[PDB]
């Protein structure tokens, strides 16, 4: 965007080579809002619960919650961060398959009422320390196998515990849409099975792994259509755990250069750069505008190796790099974008 | 490690599931001293400089500096930490190929007199902001380029400290490749006195240190030449021991025989219970943090979370939250 480029340049001008930091973040408030209203439009029946683990930055977590998003917390620290921002503990879901005893007890005292289980031991762990917490069964390491579902449901019933419903999380190898279709059908069967156990499961957590099925508008339409076709009980509500989807367009990294090496190899020179970070995606050189024939060279950018991209020859201390749409798991001053 | 086992089992018996921590560290002071004296006994002509980047934990960094070790710092934070512990800036070497301008200017004021280079640009940077700082050339295209950099060092009027490289017979080639560079630089009108062989140590060690010490003599470096190294994993490994607690268990029958998964806070031991020969063993998988991560797939007996713990021997190598100093 042009507004992001101009705001970055206005901030870069405040620095000389001697005083320039490793980099700075740009908080795209409109980028967060556009992602939320896009979700609410395409998936009306599924309320998004942001995975705080993806990006626990106070401003983003605050903004998302104010926009009506729920909260997906993996640890007690993530639980406490949400509660400190003034959000109600009912909107929080303690999504941790194996919880530390001290944290599980503290969560109960803090007012947390929703958690996830994928083992017979965790059912007993909850029954012993916080037996009032609602339990969600995780289906498909990480998850519960087909035959084990009955053994766990029996244990939840035998311990007299509350079942909120079913949960599933797909891997990083999402891409194929039909895995969500199968997992929802598998979840629908788990509901009717649990209903026979005398339980009333009202919550289906479809998990995360979004923005990995590209035509989102269409991918959201398929989930929405499948939800209707499976005919879930009238009382059932649907939540998701989108992390990468919400956090991506939230932040923009603007890094500085503090190293250069020109190396002619196999006939043509490649230029190595060292960007503001320790040596251990797509970016552009914002400081100089490309005049078409600006002599583009294959550039290797180091943190170990953050980007291999076609870039014009840059001068360390003068030239800067903008990495568009970061914050997604990538988590040093943060400047809010003007709007 | 009978003494370490008893010190842990004592601290374990103090916790119940309700208040058990994720894990605690045991700082083996004796383990550091034995590793340091092993270096000096087997490699006397090479002075060890600890890579603070490997483990910047104050207890390790302070003890090593008292034992005679130098300091290898990759950033200004590592430089300042060493100086805050009360160490002479001469013992510190700013080992960073590409330094930020602000950090380099500050390092010059802090008293840092030694740094490394591998590119022609970094030479001009040091000449522009910290010209008094001594320079080391990096070796192993980066071979014919050595002549290009040395010319830039000379033309800017900078002090050449010597040659530095980072990787059994690979060291023999690298030390010889360094010796040929020294004579090359001497013909330019420069006097390289420092040779940094790098790290990656711990290999039989005793035999490895013998080949290095022998190769040093055969190459016949000038009388003034001093030898230094950057061992990280070597010094840090035996310094700390991790004692994890268990807060997750899952039983799963696999094709006939059961495998049990565990979630805790390489080699590990169930110190909470004694394993008398046959006490029933199971293919156990131990996990850590991150909910989508895998530390061990080891042969272990059945364990109960909250009751049973884990001891990971020699874990101080690259980790960096509670430290218990091992007696005595």
Author numbering:
A (entry chain A): 5 to 144, 157 to 296, 309 to 331, 338 to 365, 379 to 386
B (entry chain B): 5 to 144, 160 to 186, 193 to 227, 230 to 292, 309 to 335, 338 to 365, 379 to 386
Paper passage:
Ornithine decarboxylase catalyzes the first and rate-limiting step of polyamine biosynthetic pathway. L-ornithine is decarboxylated by ODC enzyme in the presence of cofactor pyridoxal-5′-phosphate (PLP) to produce putrescine. The ODC enzyme is an obligate homodimer with two symmetry-related active sites located at the dimer interface. The ODC enzyme from E. histolytica belongs to fold type III group IV decarboxylase of a B6-dependent family, having eukaryotic ornithine decarboxylase characteristics.
Here, we report cloning, purification and crystal structure determination of C-terminal truncated Entamoeba histolytica ornithine decarboxylase (EhODCΔ15). The crystal diffracted to 2.8 Å resolution, possessing four molecules per asymmetric unit and the solvent content was calculated to be 46.69% with a Matthews coefficient of 2.2 Å3 Da−1. The four monomers in the asymmetric unit of crystal are arranged as two separate dimers (subunits A, B and subunits C, D) facing each other at the convex surfaces. As expected, the crystal structure of EhODC contains two equivalent active site pockets at the dimer interface formed by residues that are contributed from both the subunits. These structural details indicate that amino acid substitutions in the active site of EhODC create a novel architecture which not only makes it resistant to DFMO but also lowers its catalytic efficiency by weakening substrate binding, as the reported Km values for L-ornithine for active but DFMO sensitive T. brucei and mouse ODC enzymes are 0.24 mM and 0.09 mM respectively, whereas for DFMO resistant EhODC it is 1.5 mM.
